Amino acid sequence: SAKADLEAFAKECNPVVGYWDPLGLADLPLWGQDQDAVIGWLRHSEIKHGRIAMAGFVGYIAHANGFRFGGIGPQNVVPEGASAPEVWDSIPFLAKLQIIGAIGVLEHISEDKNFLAADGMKHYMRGGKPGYFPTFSANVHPMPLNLFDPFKWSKNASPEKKAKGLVTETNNGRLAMLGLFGFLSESKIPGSVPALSGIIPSYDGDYMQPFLPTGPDTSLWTIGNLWA
Amino acid sequence: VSDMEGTGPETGGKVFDPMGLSKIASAETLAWYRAAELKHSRVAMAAVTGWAWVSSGGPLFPGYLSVEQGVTFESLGRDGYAAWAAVPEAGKFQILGVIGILEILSESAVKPHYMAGGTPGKVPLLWDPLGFTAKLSPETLARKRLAELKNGRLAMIGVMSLVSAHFIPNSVPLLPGSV
Amino acid sequence: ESKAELESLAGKLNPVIGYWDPLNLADYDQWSQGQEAAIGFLRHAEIKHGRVAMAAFVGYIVQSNGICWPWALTGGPNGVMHSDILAAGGPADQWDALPTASKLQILLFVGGLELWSENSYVLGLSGEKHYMRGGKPGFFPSIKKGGIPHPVPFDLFDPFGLSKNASPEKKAKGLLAEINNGRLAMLGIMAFVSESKVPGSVPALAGKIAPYSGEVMAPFAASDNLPFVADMLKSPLF
Amino acid sequence: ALVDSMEGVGEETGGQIWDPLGISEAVSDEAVMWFRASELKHGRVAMLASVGYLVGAAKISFPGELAKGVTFASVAANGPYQAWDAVPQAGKLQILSIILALEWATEAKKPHYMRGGVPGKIEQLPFDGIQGLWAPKIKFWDPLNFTGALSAEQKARKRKAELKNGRLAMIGIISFITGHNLPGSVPALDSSF
Ligand SMILES: CC(=O)O[C@H]1CC(C)(C)C(=C=C/C(C)=C/C=C/C(C)=C/C=C/C=C(C)/C=C/C=C(\C)C(=O)C[C@@]23O[C@]2(C)C[C@@H](O)CC3(C)C)[C@](C)(O)C1
Ligand code: KC2
Numbered sequence: 001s002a003k004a005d006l007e008a009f010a011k012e013c014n015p016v017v018g019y020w021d022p023l024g025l026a027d028l029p030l031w032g033q034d035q036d037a038v039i040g041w042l043r044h045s046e047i048k049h050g051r052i053a054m055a056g057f058v059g060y061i062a063h064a065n066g067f068r069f070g071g072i073g074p075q076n077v078v079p080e081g082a083s084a085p086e087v088w089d090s091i092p093f094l095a096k097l098q099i100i101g102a103i104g105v106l107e108h109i110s111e112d113k114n115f116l117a118a119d120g121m122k123h124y125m126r127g128g129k130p131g132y133f134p135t136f137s138a139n140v141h142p143m144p145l146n147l148f149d150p151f152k153w154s155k156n157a158s159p160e161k162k163a164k165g166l167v168t169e170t171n172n173g174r175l176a177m178l179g180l181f182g183f184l185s186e187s188k189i190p191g192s193v194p195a196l197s198g199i200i201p202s203y204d205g206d207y208m209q210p211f212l213p214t215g216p217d218t219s220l221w222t223i224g225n226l227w228a
Numbered sequence: 229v230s231d232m233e234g235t236g237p238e239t240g241g242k243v244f245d246p247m248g249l250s251k252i253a254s255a256e257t258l259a260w261y262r263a264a265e266l267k268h269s270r271v272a273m274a275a276v277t278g279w280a281w282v283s284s285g286g287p288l289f290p291g292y293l294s295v296e297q298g299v300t301f302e303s304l305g306r307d308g309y310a311a312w313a314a315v316p317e318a319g320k321f322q323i324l325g326v327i328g329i330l331e332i333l334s335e336s337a338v339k340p341h342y343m344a345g346g347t348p349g350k351v352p353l354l355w356d357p358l359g360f361t362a363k364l365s366p367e368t369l370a371r372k373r374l375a376e377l378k379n380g381r382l383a384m385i386g387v388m389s390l391v392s393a394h395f396i397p398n399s400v401p402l403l404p405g406s407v
Numbered sequence: 408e409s410k411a412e413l414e415s416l417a418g419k420l421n422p423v424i425g426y427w428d429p430l431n432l433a434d435y436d437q438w439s440q441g442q443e444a445a446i447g448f449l450r451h452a453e454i455k456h457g458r459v460a461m462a463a464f465v466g467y468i469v470q471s472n473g474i475c476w477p478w479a480l481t482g483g484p485n486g487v488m489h490s491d492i493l494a495a496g497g498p499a500d501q502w503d504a505l506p507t508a509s510k511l512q513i514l515l516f517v518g519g520l521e522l523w524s525e526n527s528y529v530l531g532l533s534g535e536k537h538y539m540r541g542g543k544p545g546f547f548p549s550i551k552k553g554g555i556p557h558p559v560p561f562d563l564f565d566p567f568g569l570s571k572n573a574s575p576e577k578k579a580k581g582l583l584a585e586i587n588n589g590r591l592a593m594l595g596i597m598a599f600v601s602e603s604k605v606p607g608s609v610p611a612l613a614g615k616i617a618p619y620s621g622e623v624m625a626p627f628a629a630s631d632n633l634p635f636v637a638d639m640l641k642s643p644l645f
Numbered sequence: 646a647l648v649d650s651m652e653g654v655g656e657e658t659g660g661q662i663w664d665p666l667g668i669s670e671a672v673s674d675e676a677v678m679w680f681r682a683s684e685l686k687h688g689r690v691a692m693l694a695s696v697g698y699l700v701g702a703a704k705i706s707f708p709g710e711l712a713k714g715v716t717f718a719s720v721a722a723n724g725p726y727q728a729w730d731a732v733p734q735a736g737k738l739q740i741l742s743i744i745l746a747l748e749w750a751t752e753a754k755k756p757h758y759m760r761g762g763v764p765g766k767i768e769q770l771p772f773d774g775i776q777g778l779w780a781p782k783i784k785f786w787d788p789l790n791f792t793g794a795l796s797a798e799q800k801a802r803k804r805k806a807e808l809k810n811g812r813l814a815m816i817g818i819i820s821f822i823t824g825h826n827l828p829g830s831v832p833a834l835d836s837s838f
């Protein structure tokens with residue numbers, strides 16, 4: 001049973017706590033689908049939120065402390081000394097659009113029957129591995145590298161090691177979620193995360209509106225900027 | 229009446245009916261009593277939650293209520309009675325009329341009627357459109373129905389405390405004199 | 408335990424009295440989990456109050472005699488020295504003059520210990536069960552054996568293993584001494600605090616305990632800028 | 646009884662016929678066929694009118710001209726109610742003439758609905774079979790044959806949905822007109838319509 005698998009997985013994550021479902025979301029029949037499909041969805045959501053949260057945490061350290069590439073790019077418009085909330089606000093509107101669009105294309109590839117079936121896998125709600133990003137073996141142009149393990153460093157890893165890696169993924173993702181939203185919360189409700197008091201600056205604006213402020217409308221292309 | 233649900237440890241496993249209104253109640257009368265209790269409980273739960281949200285300071289509805297006539301959700305104010313006085317008569321009539329249509333649908337559409345041998349409080353449309361309480365077993369569903377009854381009885385006392393604080397000022401403690 | 412075993416332990420703690428439950432709180436069924444569960448909870452409450460009270464008695468004696476640590480409490484160019492916490496006043500005033508982070512982290516460390524004790528999986532992993540389920544009434548499990556990710560140097564009880572290889576008779580005698588010492592130490596610490604708040608309440612200690620103005624049963628003082636703290640402290644009480 | 650063998654029965658009135666006044670019980674079966682045919686015609690006309698009236702209320706109109714002097718926006722300017730009056734006369738006559746052709750061709754089918762045919766099943770090609778008359782065989786309902794993809798049970802469920810939506814639109818369009826006539830009679834309609 002999917003709930004029995006999630007039971008065991010929770011024990012692996014933390015045997016002291018074990019399963020902690022005060023809301024019974026695994027039991028709730030979301031979309032009318034069965035418990036297996038609902039648990040698949042919930043595990044995929046957990047792993048994805050965690051993944052993006054850890055990426056966001058490292059991005060917070062990179063941007064707010066100052067870590068930029070060199071050359072012509074969206075980097076050249078963000079003011080120097082700008083905090084992590086303002087770097088996203090300062091990159092161009094097209095940069096925001098194309099970042100979100102590339103992320104959307106990656107997720108479309110993730111949930112597409114095409115790539116998942118080419119890899120001999122199924123959707124996470126229909127008897128598949130929750131949180132598995134397929135190789136780009138069904139993309140039309142043969143794609144050089146895959147998203148997960150692009151250099152294939154884990155081609156020969158034990159199934160036990162991979163299971164333990166997924167267990168580490170879930171916990172680290174949850175913790176990174178907590179830390180990243182700690183960074184967010186300290187800027188809008190001061191004195192909410194005691195340790196971050198004085199470190200994270202305050203920000204006025206809506207975080208959860210992606211395109212506000214719309215940002216500069218500069219044209220950074222140089223060699224062949226006919227579209228301006 | 230002893231086999232009608234709603235009893236709990238708060239009464240001591242026994243029915244709370246000191247005046248003996250259950251003695252003079254038949255099966256139909258008892259079904260009517262339970263149906264009225266369920267309806268009043270649900271109404272009071274919604275009323276208390278709405279009044280607490282509006283008066284407490286929660287983020288109320290953005291935008292206008294009436295573009296023409298210039299009535300705004302913010303402009304209506306946080307006092308519940310003043311808000312229901314300042315909302316347009318068209319809006320009041322509309323709320324009441326939709327509630328009336330739903331009441332008449334609950335009465336007629338549920339063909340096995342709660343008075344004529346049916347389940348009291350079985351308004352068919354207005355329950356669980358997303359199917360949350362679909363896979364619950366009968367035991368937990370009975371537990372949750374008892375939860376509905378208890379919570380709503382408390383809610384009825386709460387809303388009457390609210391209107392008592394508004395009408396008879398300084399009546400209930402933990403309700404500022406205005407409302 | 409049971410009432411018979413509780414009576415036997417009372418006899419071993421003071422053979423002259425034996426069982427002394429004028430309120431019959433052992434028969435008072437609270438939590439609705441049986442007399443065994445109730446007696447287990449009461450025994451744990453006695454043992455834990457005793458442990459905290461003897462610890463706080465020694466802490467009160469040490470802090471009230473100007474024996475602050477040499478190192479600092481806060482860090483920075485303007486950090487509250489432990490000497491400044493001493494100079495804040497009497498020991499209760501020292502606690503109230505602590506930084507808010509110091510107070511929060513002290514009480515949350517204690518809370519972590521408490522939930523660690525209350526969890527049944529860690530208790531079972533260390534042996535014995537919850538004190539309301541037949542386990543030893545007062546017994547802190549092993550922070551090592553619980554399986555925390557990083558290897559901790561020492562457990563909370565007996566970090567250096569000095570009571571290790573103790574005779575079982577010595578263990579029972581030691582638990583009896585723990586309960587009795589805690590019983591007296593609760594009166595000791597509450598007598599210190601009562602002399603601090605109400606002068607002359609404990610006649611023996613006269614002028615030997617510093618005064619104190621704020622409520623002692625109030626971990627956060629006016630300096631603690633947290634939600635609702637100032638509103639709570641607005642209205643005082645005897 | 647023919648009233649016991651139709652799709653219009655819906656759970657909204659229980660699993661039972663909604664004849665409060667016994668109108669269907671006080672008539673013969675032929676009148677029941679006429680009733681079903683007229684009910685479905687009324688429902689369909691009503692939903693056409695309801696969506697059209699909403700479109701007029703929103704001031705939505707085509708880009709162009711309804712005549713050589715009037716603009717679609719111009720004739721829609723006053724509102725949905727006066728829009729029909731402001732329409733040019735020849736256009737009204739043309740709409741009425743094409744509706745006349747439709748309701749004559751559909752009537753002139755010999756299986757009919759009163760005399761041994763399915764009530765509400767308008768013949769999909771009204772103008773076919775007419776001698777010395779030619780039509781381009783654009784079948785009146787499902788000109789592009791959506792319902793062919795459905796199974797029998799699917800289209801039965803959708804016939805039930807048709808009856809429900811037609812009755813709801815019967816209420817709705819008259820709600821629009823009555824709200825325009827008596828202000829505040831239907832409070833959901835703003836002064837725009
Ligand atoms: C000393 C003194 O005088 O004090 C004063 C002050 C004080 C205490 C404030 C007073 C008061 C008023 C009080 C206390 C009022 C209490 C009001 C109360 C108790 C109000 C309940 C609302 C419940 C709702 C809306 C629930 C909806 C719930 C819903 C929609 C569901 O159940 C749905 C669902 O769960 C199911 C069924 C299945 C699950 O799968 C999960 C889901 C989500 C799908 C008094 C009386 O004045 C006295
Ligand atoms: C920014 C995002 C991101 C972060 C921050 C992150 C961090 C960690 C950490 C560190 C805490 C560990 C230890 C870990 C471990 C594993 N990751 Mg993970 N990972 C991210 C992204 C992806 C994607 C896209 C995939 C993926 C996978 C796996 C598998 C499965 C191997 C297998 O069974 O073949 C294992 C063991 C693949 C998969 O199938 O996951 C179900 C897959 O497609 N990861 N991952």
Ligand code: KC2
Pocket residue numbers: 480481482483506508509510512513514516517
């Ligand atoms: C109850 C026991 C206890 C435990 C188990 C514990 C564990 C950890 C851990 C590991 C899990 C870390 C990583 C950590 C880190 C810091 N602790 Mg901390 N700590 C405890 C107690 C106190 C007290 C009383 C104070 C304090 C402080 C600081 C400061 C900042 C100093 C500064 O202000 O420069 C830092 C960086 C002081 C303070 O001001 O905290 C804001 C302060 O007074 N801690 N502490």
Ligand code: KC2
Pocket residue numbers: 458459461462543545546547548564577578579580581582584585588589
């Ligand atoms: C403030 C803290 C504190 C103080 C000041 C304190 C003082 C005394 C005194 C002095 C008056 C004696 C004589 C005494 C004796 C014993 N204590 Mg003890 N104790 C404290 C804390 C704990 C904790 C957390 C545990 C514990 C235990 C034992 C055992 C083990 C017996 C065994 O191994 O069966 C024995 C013999 C452990 C246990 O298992 O007790 C059932 C255990 O978990 N103690 N303890």
Ligand code: KC2
Pocket residue numbers: 711712713714732733734735736737739740743
């Ligand atoms: C569904 C109903 C319908 C059908 C089936 C239909 C068919 C045809 C055919 C093919 C058989 C031709 C050849 C034709 C031609 C013209 N139609 Mg006509 N028409 C319909 C409806 C309306 C409406 C509502 C209006 C209208 C009009 C015009 C004008 C504009 C003249 C002008 O510029 O003044 C011209 C020339 C407008 C009008 O009468 O304007 C005075 C106007 O409002 N029609 N119409």
